[PDB]
């Protein structure tokens, strides 16, 4: 599952979490058997303005 988020609210990509993103965009199940990996993507996903 590949998407871009922000450090604030990034903690919601964990099982059973709430918030605008976790509730309306991507919701992980409570019984999750897997892991989430994140890395700084300033060079590719950040553009001026």
Partner 1 sequence: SALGKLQDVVNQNAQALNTLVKQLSSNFGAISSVLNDILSRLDPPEAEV
Can you tell me the distance from the alpha carbon of 45 to that of 38, in angstroms, rounded to the nearest whole number? 13
Token pair listed for 47 = 């553009």
Smallest gap from Cβ 14 to partner 1, in A, equals 7
Whose tokens are 């979490």? That residue is 17
Q: Is 17 in the site for partner 1 (CB under 8 A)?
A: yes
Among the residue ranges 2-10, 13-21, 37-45, the one whose residues contact partner 1 (CB under 8 A): 13-21
Q: Is 14 in the site for partner 1 (CB under 8 A)?
A: yes
Q: Is 8 in the site for partner 1 (CB under 8 A)?
A: no
Smallest gap from Cβ 47 to partner 1, in A, equals 34
Q: In 1-49, which ranges are E strands?
A: none
Whose tokens are 């976790």? That residue is 22
């Amino acid at each position: 599952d590949s998407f871009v988020i922000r450090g604030d609210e990034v903690r919601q990509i964990a099982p059973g979490q709430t918030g605008k993103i976790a509730d309306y965009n991507y919701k992980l199940p409570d019984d999750f058997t897997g892991c989430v990996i994140a890395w700084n993507s300033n060079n590719l996903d950040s553009k001026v303005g």
